[PDB]
Amino acid sequence: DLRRRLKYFFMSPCDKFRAKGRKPCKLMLQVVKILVVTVQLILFGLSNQLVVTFREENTIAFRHLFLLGYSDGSDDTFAAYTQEQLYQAIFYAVDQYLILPEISLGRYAYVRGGGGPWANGSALALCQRYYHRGHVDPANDTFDIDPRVVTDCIQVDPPDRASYKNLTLKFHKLINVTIHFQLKTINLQSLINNEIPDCYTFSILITFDNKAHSGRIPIRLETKTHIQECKHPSVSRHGDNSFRLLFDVVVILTCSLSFLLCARSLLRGFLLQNEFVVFMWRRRGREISLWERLEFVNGWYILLVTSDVLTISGTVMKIGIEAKNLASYDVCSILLGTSTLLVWVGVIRWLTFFHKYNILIATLRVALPSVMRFCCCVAVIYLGYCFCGWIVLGPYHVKFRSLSMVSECLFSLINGDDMFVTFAAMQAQQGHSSLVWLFSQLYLYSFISLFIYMVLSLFIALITGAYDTIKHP
Amino acid sequence: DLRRRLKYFFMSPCDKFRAKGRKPCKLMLQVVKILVVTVQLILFGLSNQLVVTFREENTIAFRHLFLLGYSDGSDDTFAAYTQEQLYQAIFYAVDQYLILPEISLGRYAYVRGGGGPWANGSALALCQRYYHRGHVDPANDTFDIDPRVVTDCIQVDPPDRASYKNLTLKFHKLINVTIHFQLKTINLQSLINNEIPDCYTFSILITFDNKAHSGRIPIRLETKTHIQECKHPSVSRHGDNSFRLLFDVVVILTCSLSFLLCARSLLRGFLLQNEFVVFMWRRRGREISLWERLEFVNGWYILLVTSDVLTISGTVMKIGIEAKNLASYDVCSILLGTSTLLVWVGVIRWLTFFHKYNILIATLRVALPSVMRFCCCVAVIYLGYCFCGWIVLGPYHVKFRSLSMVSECLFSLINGDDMFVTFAAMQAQQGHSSLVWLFSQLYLYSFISLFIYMVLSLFIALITGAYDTIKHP
Amino acid sequence: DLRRRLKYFFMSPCDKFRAKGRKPCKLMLQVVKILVVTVQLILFGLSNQLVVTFREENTIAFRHLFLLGYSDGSDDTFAAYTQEQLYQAIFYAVDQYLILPEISLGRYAYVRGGGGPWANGSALALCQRYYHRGHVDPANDTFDIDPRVVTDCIQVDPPDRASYKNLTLKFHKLINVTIHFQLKTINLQSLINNEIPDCYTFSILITFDNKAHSGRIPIRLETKTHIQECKHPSVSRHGDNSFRLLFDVVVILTCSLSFLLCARSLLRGFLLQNEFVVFMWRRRGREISLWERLEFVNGWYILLVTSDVLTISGTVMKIGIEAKNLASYDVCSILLGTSTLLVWVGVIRWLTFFHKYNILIATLRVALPSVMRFCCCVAVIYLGYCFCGWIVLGPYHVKFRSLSMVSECLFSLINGDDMFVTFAAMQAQQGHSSLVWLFSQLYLYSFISLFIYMVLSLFIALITGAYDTIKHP
Amino acid sequence: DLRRRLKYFFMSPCDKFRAKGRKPCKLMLQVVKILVVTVQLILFGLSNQLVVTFREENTIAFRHLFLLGYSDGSDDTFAAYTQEQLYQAIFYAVDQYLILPEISLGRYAYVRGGGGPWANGSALALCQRYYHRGHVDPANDTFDIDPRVVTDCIQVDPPDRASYKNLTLKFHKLINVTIHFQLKTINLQSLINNEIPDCYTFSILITFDNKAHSGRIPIRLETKTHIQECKHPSVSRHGDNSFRLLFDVVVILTCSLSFLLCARSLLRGFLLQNEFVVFMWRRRGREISLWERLEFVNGWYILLVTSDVLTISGTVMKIGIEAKNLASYDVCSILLGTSTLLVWVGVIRWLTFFHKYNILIATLRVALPSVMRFCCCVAVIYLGYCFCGWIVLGPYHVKFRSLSMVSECLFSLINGDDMFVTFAAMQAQQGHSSLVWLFSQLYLYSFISLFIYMVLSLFIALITGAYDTIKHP
Ligand SMILES: *[C@@H]1O[C@H](CO)[C@@H](O[C@@H]2O[C@H](CO)[C@@H](O)[C@H](O)[C@H]2NC(C)=O)[C@H](O)[C@H]1NC(C)=O
Ligand SMILES: *[C@@H]1O[C@H](CO)[C@@H](O[C@@H]2O[C@H](CO)[C@@H](O)[C@H](O)[C@H]2NC(C)=O)[C@H](O)[C@H]1NC(C)=O
Ligand SMILES: *[C@@H]1O[C@H](CO)[C@@H](O[C@@H]2O[C@H](CO)[C@@H](O)[C@H](O)[C@H]2NC(C)=O)[C@H](O)[C@H]1NC(C)=O
Ligand SMILES: *[C@@H]1O[C@H](CO)[C@@H](O[C@@H]2O[C@H](CO)[C@@H](O)[C@H](O)[C@H]2NC(C)=O)[C@H](O)[C@H]1NC(C)=O
């Protein structure tokens, strides 16, 4: 006698409108949510882009100001090869630091006291770390090394408007040289979006790295950015961001309404599932129910609930960022982008009621079991290839340096991408061992053949077979 | 009794020739049109290439003449990093401008009076734009900024055969520095195609951009080209372009004849459609007709009519360009190229009568409904991925800078192109946040899997199923 | 009664051996031919590589010796931008020419008298070509140009052990500057293959190209190489090339024997075809024969005859090259490589008798008719796209410069290669017209969709359908 | 009566546990082996990476110390073009060698006595090799060459704390100039993994190569590394590598146990095969057995035996390396990586008992016969294309230099990778012969069409047909 109720619970919004006159509130709510969430993501991306751009541009400016003879595009090859070059680089960094206000285009401030843990209240720390004792005498094939690391720190202070020139580097046992300092600045470009510029404290660490002890000392500059509210900010306020706050409260309201409607649908689905279970337990036997329960739960509405929870969390983080309580642009950006993707995907719920528009979703729901079973056997081969290539070809091949990079290289190879570059990276140097080159040939040829021609063909065949299963309604 | 008439309206030109002795006028007219339109496109492309080459080469010469230390291939990285560098760059630009006739290889003319809106009748304008007041004191974590933009303009004039050296830049609140001037020249290379060279006025704007306020000021040069007839041109006229005008009048005549014949075919198709409708309304019931009307209309002839309208418009624009009434080479080039593509495609009309030669068109006409239904579900996923990647990975990934660039990157990824470059762009910098790098990994892996392995397989399966439907006639 | 004869003419060499005891002479002859022809190709490639390397390395050395400030990898961007730069480049070329024996690493000789047609018996010709009269006054928007080309030649002579410094360039009407000279040298590296080094005369032409009249004069160096026998060569002859001549006479003998055997097989096939025709004309009606004739002709043996004719021609050209009667390494290399490919392909004749090993050939012979019918419709779309992209995007896109380059770009795009590079070439410059950029977007997206997703799918489907037709024997 | 025994020998570990209560010892042993072998591979890769990094970084430092004007990324284009440049390069190398301890960042030692075979007990050998007599007079088109190679050696010795400046190069007959010396150093970075640093002797050979005699002398530096134990090593020993030795003995024990269990399974399989053979010989006729023997042998257990033999060999080589008896990191790395890949693959043995998880293996075992039969015909075409492209396009195309490179290029082309780069390499230079360019067009187009569109389609069709054969259990 509830068979028509079950029919009502499982028909399209058009059918529900024709039957009980129920307007598709959730469909139009989802469309509105797509609009507002995408707009909110773009609006947040404006300020996110300003923050990232400020950090990256300041880092590039620091590299040009403090690294001697630095040119763009040579970060990986920037190195010193003679003692004079290393001394000149270190001294150039410190001298440019001392004359920074006179030369720099940006308005940078000396963070007096902040020069790292090695600093004893000074602004810049020029540290050399070497072995406790290192008697490297390769001529006699004798060395006497105490692996304990001693650090000699020269503390440099900007004038309020010298010593570091007496640096004596112990090249035979030098582990590294580092320069730590901090710089304050204000991100004025925030004003283009009617925000209040913040204070950015850049912790700059310049490393002259001798850990390889190979006659070549790479030189690198790194910055850690700390963003905080300005203590005394004064702006004439030629506008505001009411357009931001409107789209934020609208997003919150739409997501809360979606949460309520979807939770109500989950609850009624549970109630109808229990009603069906008891009806079939009185009619048929007991413990009959095994999967009808999961047929009752709407996974699309679970997705909508999760996505709007994510959107609410991202909006709250965004609002806190504009309130400047927290400044974590990466996490907020990830939350908002993931929520935007999920709200765009969630509108496919209403495309399921039509088999002509449900080819992708139905094929997926039919193929995923077989796809996972196939991937169980595929994954062990893939992981064995990953580890073998990472350790054997890692030292020699630029695309096999790290496990993640090896995975990316192999995954791209499965799709026939950068094959000749992968071969030529080994070809250009013969691996400095003909054996390693021959192994690379065998490894790459076998992997490409087995995964493009064999594994991928079967994967596509499984997906096409699922589609063939669901071709006719 | 009209059944043989309907047969006559729906048979091939060979059948029409065998039945009523009708020569295939439209077929041979289309072949002639292909020839003449392609030749006209190439002939126009000669002068179009001369114009584009002149503009691009003059811009490169300007960049080498006015940008200090400029080298090719470094447009994006060209920047100043110290106050001395910025002053030297600005002064070098102005000095090279002042000595241009003495140094430049091209015969450039000073456009006296034209120096932009900021110019008060002078030829060159050296403008600095800064905040109305900017008290950036990052040391005290205090700033006082009035976001109103004040512009100080130095007006520089070439001698008829100094002041700008007293420029005082306010680096703490400088928004940008700009140099505007104009240069006249004559595109003499036009003579190689028996055309009269025109006057090109290049509006050159050099921007030293400090809007980021990040210690790094990018330096760029842009030109806006204005092409106009020379006031007093004198050429000894060693030839003409009657070969151009012949192929232009022939194109116009062929396109008009095609328009007439196709319009006549559309009219007779409409008349026969109405005759069939009334015959079946007297024989069968009423309102019977629903799609036979669209079976009567020949879409190929609609395409031919549209394409020859486009060709006539492009030819008229071309003729006006040679007459120098209008100089809009981009629009004319687009019109002529689109018309050439459409006239080449239109010759497929006569390949439809043969099922062995109609595999592509018939498969398309069968698959497009299902393809569009599938793309309705595919497009929301694609757009969600586009927006998410554009906002989250845009600041970090060079291939995600803009929405169009994100779309191109994702579309290329669907075809397994530049996968490892996309992965390595994030890998090389770790996203400056391990979280963002992990998100990029998840984003790229999920997108590539879902679209290459799943979505694309289904798309190809739909097309192949349509082909299977039409495999046998 | 001849039915067993026809059976004998159409069975495998193993069947022929089991029936009439006929050894497979042609199969082993083909294997021997593969060996000897491949070895001969490699042996010729040694000397071919020496010749090409000598030409390329001499050209690079010339570019470094005669082009001021030249660096490798900047051939396309090498240009002059000021009058002083152009004068310095020209004078540097001439001065380096005059002091060549003192500075150059190679032993170059001055070709006294050979300086081009513009030379009046002098070794170097410094020519400037300009308009007969050119009164370019862009300031008054007036020009007076006589398009006749006047050439002023300065004749420079190396000392037997000045004037050219008085060059006055007419920049306002200069078409180009050229430097022609010739240099003799001896390719001593030939001795590593026991050959006699030849005399190479390099005709060097340095062009300062002002045909664009755009303030930027590209500078390029080209060499034309003439190889001829040395007049008085003296080598102590530490070996010979009997190993070459043995493999050349063996190739000639094997190819002639293959030609004889295949011609005999063609003749007997013709005789049996005529015998079958007359037998079926006496048995059945007349004019019965239509295709059995082409079933009788063995296309594989026609291929073998053509390939061994090519191999004989290539071997004769090779022998003439070692005899130094003719020195045309490119034509001989093309002939020998094409013959090597054809002899490797010809061994597939004997793989046809087995259906398990004949999948590729049988599928081809079944699919080529349908493939050509499909390509008839595909080719018009491809050509329309080619012409449209070549003329519209040619000026702007680096991959659309020429029709062959456009074809290569589109063909690579069909296979999903360099998609993002094609998009980004337009993206990086916005086409200098938003309209052209939008057209490029539409053009590329439509082409890629239609050819990868639609056309290629149908092509693969046709090939797979042919395979399905021949899946079972 | 043994039918249940045969059933027992051919059921899954779960079935064996349910029947006879046999725990799956080999499955858990294989999982443990995967863990321990992968961990051992990573642990060895740490030290392998240190060794390779030390060699590569020392080579880069040597190139920067001894090559005049050297910059990274220009190894292939590094060359001298004038006599002064060559003299300056040679003298700079020798002078930098003489002042190495004063300038170099690394602690290098002079290997007194070791300067190559050309050295008469001196540390550095500056050798020039030229012809016995070479009277190259290209002006008179006459040369007199004795191909015997004379070597003039200047012996340079570092001071214990000049002559080589009198070098007179015979450029007209110079074959090459070489500088041989040796340098000792200690790889201190080994201490980061609690190893004892070794002594590395680098044999440095700098070649100024004039074998082309083309005015351009490439300059290259090569190092051969010899690693040996330090004679008197002293380290305070802040730790050990018991974590390494534990995982090495565990690997040895696990591999030996796997070897024993798999050998026992092979033996019982042989015994049951013989028992079945005799039972069916008493029941049915004789010589009945033909393939049941190979159905009895478990190929997976053969793979496991081979893989654990490889793992034991690699572990023994590793232990010897830490013991410093032998220092062959490449061979040990290859062994350990191959064993890791094989142990990861071997866990697929237990996935065969389930048809849903055995799609890949079953398809392979069904498709490999047909795949090999197809590849028999494919390989001759591929090899003919390889040889033809290698010899004809090798001199001109950068991707066709060597046979292995040609194979990689063609294999990548089969997968639609670097197509436009392959076309553009010929396009950029027109092959310096329009004929060669046209041949390259025909060659590349024909190869790509035939292998992507035709050969690859058939290959995928064969694999898919095998899958279709095994789709249902
Ligand atoms: C310079 O070398 C020292 C000595 O190796 C490094 O100090 C180590 O730093 C890491 C991370 O900061 C710590 O986990 C270790 O405990 C430190 N000591 C040792 C002995 O490893 C230091 O990191 C190096 N500096 C740079 C910038 O690389
Ligand atoms: C230099 O900076 C000024 C100040 O921001 C820019 O002026 C703006 O220009 C745009 C477009 O020309 C206008 O829409 C705005 O109204 C202007 N004012 C402001 C406050 O934005 C100017 O464009 C910059 N110059 C360059 C070359 O980038
Ligand atoms: C320098 O400019 C002159 C003038 O344009 C060029 O001379 C032409 O050369 C081509 C081919 O050599 C001939 O077909 C023409 O008849 C010549 N005259 C004209 C008016 O075109 C000359 O080729 C240019 N030199 C270089 C190296 O480009
Ligand atoms: C410098 O040139 C000499 C002369 O050609 C080369 O000497 C040959 O070296 C190879 C391998 O070392 C030997 O097989 C030959 O027998 C040597 N002589 C000849 C005549 O070939 C020498 O290898 C060259 N040096 C370098 C570094 O290339």
Residue numbers in the entry:
A (entry chain A), B (entry chain B), C (entry chain C), D (entry chain D): 40 to 200, 216 to 527
Paper text:
Transient Receptor Potential Mucolipin 1 (TRPML1) is a Ca2+-permeable, non-selective, lysosomal cation channel ubiquitously expressed in mammalian cells. TRPML1 plays critical roles in many important cellular activities including lipid accumulation, signaling transduction, lysosome trafficking, and autophagy. The loss-of-function mutations in TRPML1 directly cause the lysosomal storage disorder mucolipidosis type IV (MLIV), a neurodegenerative disease characterized by abnormal neurodevelopment, retinal degeneration, and iron-deficiency anemia. TRPML1 can be allosterically regulated by various ligands including natural lipids and small synthetic molecules and the channel undergoes a global movement propagated from ligand-induced local conformational changes upon activation.
A key interaction coupled to the S4 bending movement is the insertion of Tyr404 side chain into a pocket surrounded by S1, S3, and S4 helices where its aromatic ring is sandwiched between the side chains of Leu66 and Arg403. To test this, we replaced Tyr404 with tryptophan and alanine, respectively, and measured the effect of these mutations on channel activity. As illustrated in the electrophysiological recordings using whole-cell patches, the Y404W mutant elicits large inward-rectifying currents without any ligands, indicating that Y404W is a gain-of-function (GOF) mutant. To reveal the structural basis underlying the channel activation of the Y404W mutant, we determined its structure in the absence of any ligands to 2.86 Å resolution. As expected, the Y404W mutant adopts an open conformation with a structure almost identical to other ligand-activated open TRPML1, consistent with its GOF property. Like Tyr404 in the wide-type open TRPML1, the side chain of W404 in the mutant is inserted into the pocket surrounded by S1, S3, and S4 helices and sandwiched between Leu66 and Arg403. However, the larger indole ring of Trp404 provides a better spatial fitting into the pocket than the phenol ring of Tyr404 and several surrounding residues (Lys65, Gln69, and Leu358) provide extra van der Waals contacts to the Trp404 side chain. Thus, by enhancing the stability of the aromatic side chain inside the pocket, Y404W mutation facilitates the bending of S4 which in turn propagates to the pore through the S4-S5 linker and activates the channel. The Y404W mutant structure demonstrates that the sidechain packing in the pocket is essential for stabilizing the open channel and the lack of such packing capacity in the Y404A mutant with a small side-chain likely destabilizes the open conformation, yielding a loss-of-function channel. The Y404W GOF mutant mimics a ligand-activated channel, yet its mutation site is remote from the pore domain and the channel can still be allosterically inhibited by small molecule antagonists (ML-SI1 and ML-SI3).
